[PDB]
């Protein structure tokens, strides 16, 4: 079976691989072998761009060992499998137009256990974990999951642009943050797994910023707001009209 | 059905324990008690493990029977068992000359921890073990520091950190005393002015709170003049080294060597400072009076008489007649003609309580009914605040009452957290 899987990996044939996996699914004896085969089927489903099977297999893997080992065992010492499956689930959820859960299940990654540059590189992992968190996470959980998180600090310094973006957005700075977001947008569009989901994310981020800009104010100056959001007063007025309408 | 046979086997075990522990010699009693209880427990645990795949109720009843039998209180007599176990520990850890390798001692202690866990009155055993460990550490009777550390670690695992909190500090005090002595030697050696103490000085600086030793006696022992420079230099060193502390020299626990070299070279004697001040006062002449010793050593009457009796045991000084009783002459004299044979000559040798317990139990029950759920700290605080009207509670007594009410099924420990109590 191992040689057959290797041959299917190096050949590209997937239909016979699916048939063989369906035939061999009934033959399970040890949890470790089930883990390896589940990881392989997750990889082939990612290649096939079929996320329903990814979600089903992830849910099965989590629910099999008495609800994910109850509360939780000793944190990852050398078992890098959990980071790999979390990263795969994050990619699947991000590609399924679900940014919040992708950020939630992608932020729980360790640099020491993310040394497999075959699924998602550290640079774009940090890019995704920063962009999705900025777009979907509120201030409290963004503070408690990104800035306060020391594990994600390594990812943030790996891609300094995202770290600067998050830090400036958190500290009520929007002119520089949005300018750098626009500057990095061109590189983000050249990406593969983020580009179709970039534009909407960007708008979300902007809207969040807009709301935050008016959170501590009961009367605000439109000129300063427009200067802080790198736009003219008329465009800002239209955008705020749309935001108030909804 | 089930409770009937459980009860009858419990009485059978209890009577078997009494029969095994009875008719024993009073000399080797600790060892026989420990060995008999250990062998009974091992046989019974083997019997219950080999048959019926555990059956937890059987060993639970066995543990209950052991707990009830070890706290065998004679009428008006205190429970001798914790003292017996502490004496067994001290004898095992002392430097006996009959082999007693470290591995065997460790095995004996880790087997003994099982019978130790049934004491239920562990504060008396803790105080006895602390006192005997203090004596062993001060007098150097410990055969190995590793064995003492292993015993303290075993006790900590058995009960907790708080139980072995003072013993850890005593062990660290012994560990750091050597460093303190080396630093003091460096300090006197590196002074700008030359310091000649005239005495080879070694000190054991110990924590006042951790060690059971204290200046409880009101002895007014005047310091000998020869070693005053040592105490002054070490006080200066301690002031320069540790700021904000003070030193209280235990003059009844410090010993030293006095050398005789011009009286026929009778080797060197080793005596306590109490037994050394009188010898130093004997420098004026061969015979001295009680008044001279009182004015020189400035010791209390009880301590001075104890020193005189110990000297008479040594036959260092003597009285010509039988007038050594309470009088005004007390004409002691030297007995240099009775010279030593060896060289070392190393000589080295309640109604209110029941009322308070009942009050605490009633207060705990009433508070537990009032709240129906609480934490340990909250329960202790409420009990103290309620019973402060009549007396100041002791936390050990409150915890003992909590345990005895848990055994009596008045209150129970929560399944989720062991520090939470619920009224049942």
């Amino acid at each position: 079976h191992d040689d057959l899987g290797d041959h299917y990996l190096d050949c590209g044939d997937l239909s016979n691989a699916l048939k063989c996996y369906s035939r061999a699914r009934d033959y399970c004896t040890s949890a470790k072998h089930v883990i390896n085969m589940c990881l392989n089927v997750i990889k082939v489903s990612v290649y096939l761009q079929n996320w329903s099977h990814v979600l089903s297999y992830v849910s099965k893997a989590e629910s099999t060992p008495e609800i994910a080992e109850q509360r939780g065992e000793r944190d990852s010492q050398t078992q890098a499998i959990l980071t790999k499956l979390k990263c795969a689930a994050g990619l699947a959820e991000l590609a399924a137009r679900k940014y919040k859960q992708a950020a939630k299940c992608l932020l729980l990654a360790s640099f020491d256990h993310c040394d497999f540059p075959e699924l998602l590189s550290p640079s774009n992992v940090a890019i995704y974990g920063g962009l999705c968190a900025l777009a979907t996470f509120d201030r409290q959980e963004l503070q408690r999951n990104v800035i306060s998180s020391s594990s994600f600090k390594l990812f943030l310094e790996l891609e300094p642009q995202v770290r600067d973006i998050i830090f400036k957005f958190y500290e009520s700075k929007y002119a520089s943050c949005l300018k750098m977001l626009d500057e990095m947008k061109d590189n983000l569009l050249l990406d593969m797994y983020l580009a179709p989901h970039v534009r909407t994310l960007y708008t979300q981020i902007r809207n969040r910023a807009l709301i935050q800009y008016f959170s501590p104010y009961v009367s605000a100056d439109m000129h300063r707001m427009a200067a802080a959001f790198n736009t003219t007063v008329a465009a800002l007025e239209d955008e705020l009209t749309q935001l108030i309408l909804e | 059905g089930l409770p009937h046979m459980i009860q009858e086997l419990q009485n059978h075990i209890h009577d078997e324990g009494l029969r095994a522990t009875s008719n024993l010699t009073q000399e080797n009693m600790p060892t026989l008690f420990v060995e008999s209880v250990l062998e009974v427990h091992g046989k019974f645990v083997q019997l219950i493990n080999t048959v019926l795949n555990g059956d937890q109720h059987f060993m639970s009843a066995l543990d209950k029977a052991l707990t009830s039998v070890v706290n065998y209180r004679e009428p008006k007599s205190v429970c001798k068992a914790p003292e017996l176990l502490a004496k067994y520990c001290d004898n095992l850890l002392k430097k006996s000359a009959k082999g007693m390798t470290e591995n065997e001692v460790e095995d004996r202690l880790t087997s003994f921890i099982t019978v130790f866990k049934y004491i239920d009155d562990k504060d008396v055993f803790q105080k006895f073990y602390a006192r005997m460990l203090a004596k062993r550490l001060i007098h150097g009777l410990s055969m190995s520091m590793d064995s003492e550390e292993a015993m303290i670690n075993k006790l900590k695992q058995a009960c907790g950190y708080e139980f072995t909190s003072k013993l850890h500090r005593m062990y660290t005090d012994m560990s750091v005393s050597a460093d303190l002595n080396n630093k003091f030697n460096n300090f006197i050696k590196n002074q700008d002015t030359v310091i000649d103490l005239g005495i080879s000085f070694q000190i054991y600086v110990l924590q006042a709170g951790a060690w059971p030793l204290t200046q409880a006696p009101s002895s007014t022992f005047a310091i000998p003049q020869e070693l005053e420079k040592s105490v002054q230099m070490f006080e200066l060193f301690y002031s320069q080294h540790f700021s904000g502390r003070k030193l209280t020299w235990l003059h009844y626990l410090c010993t030293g060597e006095v050398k005789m070299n011009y009286l026929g070279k009778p080797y060197v004697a080793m005596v306590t400072t109490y037994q050394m001040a009188v010898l130093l006062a004997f420098n004026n002449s061969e015979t001295v009076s009680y008044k001279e010793l009182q004015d020189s050593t400035q010791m209390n009457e009880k301590e001075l008489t104890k020193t005189i009796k110990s000297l008479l045991d040594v036959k260092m000084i003597n009285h010509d007649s039988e007038k050594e009783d309470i009088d005004a002459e007390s004409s002691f004299s030297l007995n240099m003609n009775f010279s030593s044979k060896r060289t070392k000559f190393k000589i080295t040798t309640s109604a209110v309580d029941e009322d308070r317990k009942m009050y605490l139990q009633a207060a705990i029950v009433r508070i537990m009914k009032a709240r129906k759920v609480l934490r340990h700290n909250a329960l202790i605080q409420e009990v103290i605040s309620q019973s402060r009207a009549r007396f100041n509670p002791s936390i050990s007594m409150i915890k003992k009452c909590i345990e005895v009410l848990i055994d009596k099924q008045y209150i129970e420990r929560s399944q989720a957290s062991a520090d939470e109590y619920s009224y049942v």
Partner: protein, 82 residues
């Protein structure tokens, strides 16, 4: 130099803090005062811990209903002495 000299002295001494406790860390009043709470509106005594830190009984009672640790050493609080 003398007739019966002394060679060695194995001294034993006990060290203790010059000032153990002089003010409750919570109320900032002296440990023999009225804990600042009994002072403004009324038995006030000392409550030691396993660390021997000796706060006011009422002050440590008020502190324990919110935090489970000792104010000074930030370790788990256990009552001892009263």
């Amino acid at each position: 130099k003398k007739r019966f000299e002394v060679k060695k002295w194995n001294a034993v001494a006990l060290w203790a803090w010059d000032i153990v406790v002089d003010n409750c860390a919570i109320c900032r009043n002296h440990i023999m005062d009225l804990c600042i709470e009994c002072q403004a509106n009324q038995e006030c005594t000392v409550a030691w811990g396993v660390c021997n830190h000796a706060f006011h009984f009422h002050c440590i009672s008020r502190w324990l209903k919110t935090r489970q640790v000792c104010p000074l050493d930030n370790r788990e609080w256990e009552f001892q002495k009263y």
